[PDB]
Design a protein around this ligand. Structure first.
Ligand code: CA
Length: 10
């Protein structure tokens, strides 16, 4: 999410 992948999140 944030249109990104990282911090264990999409
Ligand atoms: Ca969002």
């Amino acid at each position: 999410x944030x249109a990104s992948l990282x911090x264990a999140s999409l």
